[PDB]
Amino acid sequence: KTISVRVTTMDAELEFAIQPNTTGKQLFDQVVKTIGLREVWFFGLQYQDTKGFSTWLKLNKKVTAQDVRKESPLLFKFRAKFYPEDVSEELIQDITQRLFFLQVKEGILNDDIYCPPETAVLLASYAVQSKYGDFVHKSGYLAGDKLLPQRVLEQHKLNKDQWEERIQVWHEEHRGMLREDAVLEYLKIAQDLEMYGVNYFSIKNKKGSELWLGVDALGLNIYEQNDRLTPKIGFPWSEIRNISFNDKKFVIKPIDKKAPDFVFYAPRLRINKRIRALCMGNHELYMRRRKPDTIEVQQMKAQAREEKHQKQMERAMLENEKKKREMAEKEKEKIE
Structure with missing residues (x-):
């Protein structure tokens, strides 16, 4: 009837049982609900497909319908x-x-x-x-x-x-x-x-030169094969009009109509699809950031500001009572 599933976060080994019709969204929601997480936008569930590749679980599709490695329990990793x-x-x-x-x-x-x-x-x-x-x-x-x-x-x-x-x-x-x-x-x-928060992918230009592609929160970057710390050419999200995806090929189209288009290639279609998912996801987050915070987000921030300030003052009073009790202890004892 049920499929045993293991979901390891960075500091938790969560055990669950899914139904054969359970969607990745249902499984994801249960994971974040169990750990008490609200900021879900940064996270996803990874798994090894039967071919040995790291794959992000599609949430709007049955867990059983994806290439989940045929073992018991099913092994997923909750990560950012x-x-x-x-x-x-x-x-x-x-x-x-x-x-x-x-x-x-x-x-x-x-x-x-x-x-x-x-x-x-x-x-x-x-x-x-x-x-x-x-x-x-x-x-x-x-x-x-x-x-x-x-x-x-x-x-x-x-x-x-x-x-x-x-x-x-x-x-x-x-x-x-x-x-x-x-x-x-x-x-x-x-x-x-x-290298923090940068997703590297091995690409080739039209010539066939071996490069690296970085997909990060602030845009895209092209690195030389011998250097992944310094990008040779960078593309901020503010300058990318769109990225066209077509079977192993992607074209970075500029917002500056005078600037050239940039053509690169992924070695396999798996890689190109991976690129597109991280491009789409990161630009959407980038879009959110340019628009001011949701009243939901403004309040969540205020809640955290109130909690931290309460903890700070609670600790500042315990320290003040340590000085007051110590001061009184000395005031009394001097007497004789």
Whole structure:
């Protein structure tokens, strides 16, 4: 009757049972409802199709109707398909910031997002303040954690302990900072990386030259094969009139009627379709951002501002009572 389904978020292993007629939308809604997520626009469910490829689940189509790998349970990954332009301004809920922080942290540690050594150490200390809190405390406490990318550890011949000492220094500066604030500070720094939130695809021009295509929140970018940090030519969403898609081929059409069209090719149709989905999705988010916030969004932001300010003042009063009780304790004891 039912199909057992596993849905792994960055920090949850959710088990569900779908009906044979369950749509991807029904499954998605249950996932976000269970984790208590409102900002769904950035997210989607990934799966390995029977051919071995990473695929986004189509929500307006039965889960059973797609090329879901024939295993028990069905394995899906809940992850962020789209990135914001600014984490501070667009990642309102703590659940959203934590799920983006863990996915970005994963990408940094796997060498997928280039991060320089000094920045990697700074990032690691924020991950530490979030896990370990304030910090007697502990010695060799960071030995069992994955804290830096492998190219950082490779390039720098620092023994394991020297890295933890270098991060421990940064971790002691952080003392006082909330776990929630460490998560936002990680995202603030991580979002300035060149590879952050960029979807790379291997393309060829009309000549047949091998290039890279980046699809990000602010537009499109063309990279040389030997360099994915610096785009050779960039296309902001504000300058793209449209992108024409036709079987492995895509044409970036400019808003400047004097500017030329740009023709590129995907090696397979799977890749071209993937490009179109991320182009359409990112430009729609971009469109939303140019138009002022929904009253729903303005209120959600105000709600979060009220909650954070209440927590800040609640903590400021506990600290003030510590000084008052201590002050009275000394005022009484002086007597004799």
